Amino acid sequence: NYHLARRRTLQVVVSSLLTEAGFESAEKASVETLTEMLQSYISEIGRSAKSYCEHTARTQPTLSDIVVTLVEMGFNVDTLPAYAKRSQRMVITXXXXXXXXXXXXXXXXXXXXXXXXXXXXXXXXXXXXXXXXXXXXXXXXXXXYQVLREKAASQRRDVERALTRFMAKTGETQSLFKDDVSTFPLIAARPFTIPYLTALLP
Amino acid sequence: KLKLSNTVLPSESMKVVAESMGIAQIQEETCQLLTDEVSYRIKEIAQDALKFMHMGKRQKLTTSDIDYALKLXXXXXXXXXXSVEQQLYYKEITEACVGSCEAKRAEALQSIATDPGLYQMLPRFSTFISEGVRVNVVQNNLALLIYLMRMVKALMDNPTLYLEKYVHELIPAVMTCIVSRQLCLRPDVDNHWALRDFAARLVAQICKHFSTTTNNIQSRITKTFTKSWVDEKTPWTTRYGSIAGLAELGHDVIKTLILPRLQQEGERIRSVLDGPVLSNIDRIGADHVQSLLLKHCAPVLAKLRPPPDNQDAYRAEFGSLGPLLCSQVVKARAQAALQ
């Protein structure tokens, strides 16, 4: 796709030479076909001079080389100064266009860790660890001794008071004040038949 | 498993092309075998240009290729989704989102927008990003706001990381950034308007991708801003964020919406302007808001109406738009003359 603009630039040169001629209208496909003919004529010059100045062992095609090329390719060069009166003096030169840029970026992690490790070659760029390598997650140490046994004993106290509240509101209840179902609802007495088998039983 | 019959041109068309030069009265089998022969040479050359481009090693065939062809029991403890490495990379991401050095800022922004295949320092990242949004909405701090909103922008342009499944804890943080009460200081509400502009711009970047489905995007955000615009006795930050979000939805959106809201919001203008005794915070706020949304709404009716009869167009727009609407129409005519 991106090649095409030079070809349409040649089409602009075609339109410039038609303007110097003075055609008001044209046939578009014929115009572009003539443009193709023009670029093939350019390349025909280039092939001719290419294989022609390889007849020297050195390369560089000079002026008289191209003179003999164009006379070989059929042109009276004597009109070339006079056509200068038409060419660079009656048609305005069009300018080229090429908009190239190199954008900026930054992705700074901090990990290389192997510059030229064992396959040593100091022409590379190690990416990171943030993409290539990986690791392992255990993520739960929690080993704070006194804090641990605080957790356990506090939880034991919780289960104490929980079962206390449960059988507090469950069974026969007698209080400390009057009507403490909220604060202190002590379980009332069972008294049962055989005390010793119960109270002396590990 | 395959049959390659001869692609043979209809010989009557070939006689039409022939007798276009005016040759003779032609029999069929002549042109039939002619199409055969030319098809042989064409398909031979077609194999040949294939041999070209299967050593030039592209599967597309140009004109130039054929031009060169014409040279003829307790369970194990868990492990997170992260690595330790990439979660520390994530911590770098976060503290560069904090980052005072704008080089570190832009580094973070590029690192967001161009780490495709990351995908796994996704939602956890974005999730208590949104939680930090809520907490700093409470803290009411514009710097964290602009950092997170440009962060969401860079999230929106990292093309591989598809938003769909993880949309629905992000967009409400954006709209909470839109709505109200971004009040660091009362003389410093100025940057918050640009924050709302940038936010509604982000919503505009959202809306072009997701409302094909379930219409949470278009229908819910439009009706949100609709009934939000209906909400009387609200601070004008709400009004600005609503109308700016509707502005970012598009030309025809505003063509629907600010067709009655032209003169209805002009009634809101001259309720504000030539209005109260003194509340200059709200006066200057709502005044520049109305001015901004006026000349930002202006290209719709500029594209809609021709720029004639500015005295009548002010009557067609409740006066207060005139001639700032007419000045914006002059600016639009200048922008058209730039073309």
Residue that has been written with the tokens 């993409």 in this structure: A131
What is the radius of gyration, based on Cα positions, of chain A?
50
Please give the Cα distance from A56 to A5 (Å, whole number): 36
> From B91, which residue of chain A is nearest by alpha-carbon distance?
A109
Give the count of alpha carbons within 13 A of A96, CB side only: 5
Residue that has been written with the tokens 């800022």 in this structure: B105
Collect all residues of chain B within an 8 Å Cβ-Cβ radius of residue A109: 89, 92
**Contact (Cβ atoms closer than 8 angstroms) between residue A106 and residue B110:** yes
Collect all residues of chain A within an 8 Å Cβ-Cβ radius of residue B76: none
Dig out the tokens for A7 from the structure. Answer: 């070809």
B216 secondary structure, DSSP code: I
Please give the Cα distance from B30 to B11 (Å, whole number): 9
Residue (of B214, B308, B318, B310) closest to B259 by Cα position: B318
Q: Do B111 and A106 touch (CB under 8 A)?
A: yes
Q: Do A137 and B107 touch (CB under 8 A)?
A: no
Q: How far is A22 from chain B (nearest CA, A)?
A: 29
Please give the Cα distance from A60 to A63 (Å, whole number): 10
Please give the Cα distance from B309 to B81 (Å, whole number): 65
Interface contact A137, partner B, CB < 8 A: yes
C-alpha distance across the termini of chain B, in Å: 59
Dig out the tokens for B117 from the structure. Answer: 């295949």
Residue (of B100, B325, B296, B301) closest to B194 by Cα position: B296
Residue A130 to residues A125, B90, B310, Cα–Cα distance (Å): 14, 9, 61
Experimental method: cryo-EM
Amino acid at B52: F
**Contact (Cβ atoms closer than 8 angstroms) between residue B136 and residue B144:** yes
Please give the Cα distance from B277 to B257 (Å, whole number): 31
Residue (of B173, B194, B299) closest to B241 by Cα position: B194
Buried b (16+ CB within 10 A) or exposed e, A3-38: eeeeeeebbeebeeeeeeeeeeeeeeeeeeebbeee
**Contact (Cβ atoms closer than 8 angstroms) between residue B37 and residue B26:** no
Interface contact A125, partner B, CB < 8 A: no
Sign of the CA dihedral with A87 first, then A88, A91, and A96 last: positive
Please give the Cα distance from B284 to B271 (Å, whole number): 14
Q: Do B110 and A106 touch (CB under 8 A)?
A: yes
Of B78, B79, B89, the CB nearest to A130: B89
Between vectors from CA A109 to CA A108 and to CA A112, what angle results, nearest 5°? 115
Q: Do B80 and A130 touch (CB under 8 A)?
A: no
